[PDB]
Design a protein around this ligand. Sequence first.
Ligand SMILES: [Zn+2]
Ligand SMILES: [Zn+2]
Lengths: 350, 366
Amino acid sequence: PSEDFVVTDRGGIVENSHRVHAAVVDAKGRLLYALGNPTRMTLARSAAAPAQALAILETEGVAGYGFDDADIALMCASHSSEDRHIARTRAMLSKIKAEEADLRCGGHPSLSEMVNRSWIKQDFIPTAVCSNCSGKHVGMLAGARAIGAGTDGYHLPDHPMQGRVKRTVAELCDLDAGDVEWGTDGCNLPTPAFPLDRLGRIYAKLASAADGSDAGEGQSTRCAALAHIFRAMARYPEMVAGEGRYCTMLMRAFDGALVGKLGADASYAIGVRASDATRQLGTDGALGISVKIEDGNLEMLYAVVTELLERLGIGSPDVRSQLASFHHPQRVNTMGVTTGGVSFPFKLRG
Amino acid sequence: DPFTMTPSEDFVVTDRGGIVENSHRVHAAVVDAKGRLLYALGNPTRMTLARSAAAPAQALAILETEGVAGYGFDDADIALMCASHSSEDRHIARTRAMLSKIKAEEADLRCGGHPSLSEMVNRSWIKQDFIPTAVCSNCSGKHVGMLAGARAIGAGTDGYHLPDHPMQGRVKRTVAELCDLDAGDVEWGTDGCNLPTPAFPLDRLGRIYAKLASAADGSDAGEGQSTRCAALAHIFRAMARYPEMVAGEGRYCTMLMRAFDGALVGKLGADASYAIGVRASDATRQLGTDGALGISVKIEDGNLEMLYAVVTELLERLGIGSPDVRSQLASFHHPQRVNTMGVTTGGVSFPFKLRGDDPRLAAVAR
Ligand SMILES: [Zn+2]
Ligand SMILES: [Zn+2]
C-alpha cells in the first residue's frame, strides 16, 4: 500500500499532511484503482444511508404510506437542517401518523455553519426533528409501524427493523454477517464498519441498478429499489445535504451522472453510471468510488474527492469547475493575503 | 509486536465501540535547557511551522527594542504580546490601552479581524451581528508591540509587519538565535494575522521554551543575567501570572497554566502545535536533567482536540503535575464522545511510546 497524502503548505512550507485511502471498483466490486489501503476497515457512518433506505423500502407495507422521491432522498440524507428539511420531516411523520416525540434521534448544531449561525442568533435549541438523520429515522419508524413491530425501540439492535438494516448492509457488501462490525452513531442508530472497497461496492450497485432501469432490463425488486434510490438522490440532492454543501453541489453539477454521499469523520462514496469516462477506465459497467481521510478532516476529503474525479476523467472540466472552491480550498489570511495551498502528491495505482 | 515498535507508529486514535474511527500521527520533543534531546515521539526534528507558539520570541524581540521600555508596558501587556487571545472584552480593552500608551490608533494595526478562538465569545458576536475588526485579532497585543518597537527606533509604522521592516529583521534574528540556528535553517511564511511566521525543527521549539523556563529559574535564584536572560525571565513571569491574557477563559493554555500555578508556561500554535517550558523541579530531575525542560508537540494532520489530549497524556507520562492539578484538564485529556441522545459511543487512546530496548531496534524518526 502506498504512502498517499494530501498536503497543505504555508509559503511552500509543509503545514499538515493527511493520509488518503481510496477504492475504485466495478459493478461487482472488483478493485480497479486505489489510494493507500483500499480495504481499510472503515466506519461508513452516514455514507451507509442508501443501504438503510433500501432496508426501509424493502419492508412489507412501507409502500402504502406514499413516500415520494424527495422523501426517499431525505431518507438518504445528512441534511443541513434547513427549514425545508424540517418541513419534509414533519410531512413524512404525518404520512405515517407519527409525532416528533416518536423520534429516537437528538438535535445537534447544524452541519451548515450558516444555518447554525442563524440558530445561534435566535436562541434556537435544535430538537429531534432537526437531526441530520431525521429522514432515515422517520423511515425506520415507518418500517416498524408497517410490520406491526412497535415503535419505541425501532433504533435498538435487537429490533426487527435493525435486523433488516443489518442484513441489508451485509448483502449489499457481499459479506457474511460476521464480517461487518457495528457501533453506535451520533443519531443513536447502529452504524456499520467494513472494508473501504465494499462502501464503493454499494454505490457501484446503486449506479448499476440505475443503468439497468434506464435500459429496460428485467430487474429484481431489489435492483429496481436501488434504481429508485439513485434516482431520488440525483433528483433532490438538496434533500441529501443542502445549500452550499459538497454533496448537493457535486450531484447538481453532474445532473444525474452520479450520486455521492458524505460519511462523518471524512468518508465519501460515489456511484457513477456507465459513461465514456467509465469505459475509458476499463470497465463495461457502472463504477464505485469510496474515500477515507485517515485523520477525519472534511475540508481535505472534498479536496481529495474532487482531485480524484479529475484524475479519473469523470465529468468535464467545465462540470468539475463548479467544485473549484472545494478542490483548492481558500488559504487567505485576515488581510486578504494568500498564505499557501493544498497539494496532492499521491498517485492512483491501477 | 511490542519488541519492534517504531516512531512511525506513534498515534493518538479515536474509536467508536472499539472500531477505529480516526488516527493522528504524533511528533514530540522533550529537551533540556541547552536543547539536548531527552525524550521523543515520532520525528522530534520535524520541520514545523511554530505559528503563534513562536509568540514569546516575538515578545522578546519587542522588549529588546531600544526605547520600548519607556512606554511602560506592564506584565499583563507583555502576556498579551505572548497571546493568541479569545478576543474577550478585556483583551480588546487592553489592546486599546496599549495603543494609547504608544499614541497609536486601531487604523495603524496591520492585522485583521476573525471569528473568535472562543466558541462562547463567538456566540455573543453572532447574536449582536458583531463584525470583528483589527483590534479584535488574537494577535493584537503582538501587533501593538511591533508598532511600539517601530516607533521607538524611528522606523516608521507603515510596513512594520513586512519582512524588510527592521522590526521583522529583529524578529527573524531573535528567533534564529533562540533556536541556535543559522538564518538559512529557519524558513518563513505569512501567518493569519499577516506577520512573518517561522518554521524550524520541532525540537528547537522545545528549546525556546526550555530557555524561558531556565531564565525564570535564574532570575528567581538571584543569578546575574544578561539582558536577554532577564527579558526571557520577565516573559515567563508575565505569561504565568496573567495566563488569561495568553488565551482566555476555558482555553487550554490558560487552564494549563493556572493549574500549574507558576511551574510552567505553555502556548498553542495554530494547526496543532504546542510548546511548554518547565521550571527545574523534582519532576525534571527524575526525568534526568539538572535544569529546566522544554516540550514541543505537533499533530501531523493539525487536529486541535487531539493536540490537547496528547499534550495532557504526555505531561502525565513525564510525571509533570499532580493528578490533582492535572485533573483540571480532564475534559481535554479524554474528550467526550457522547451522541445526541446522551449515549457514549467511543473514546480516545494513545498508542504511542515515549522513547529516550534491543540495540538492533532502529528508531527511524518519522
Ligand atoms: Zn444517522
Ligand atoms: Zn500572529
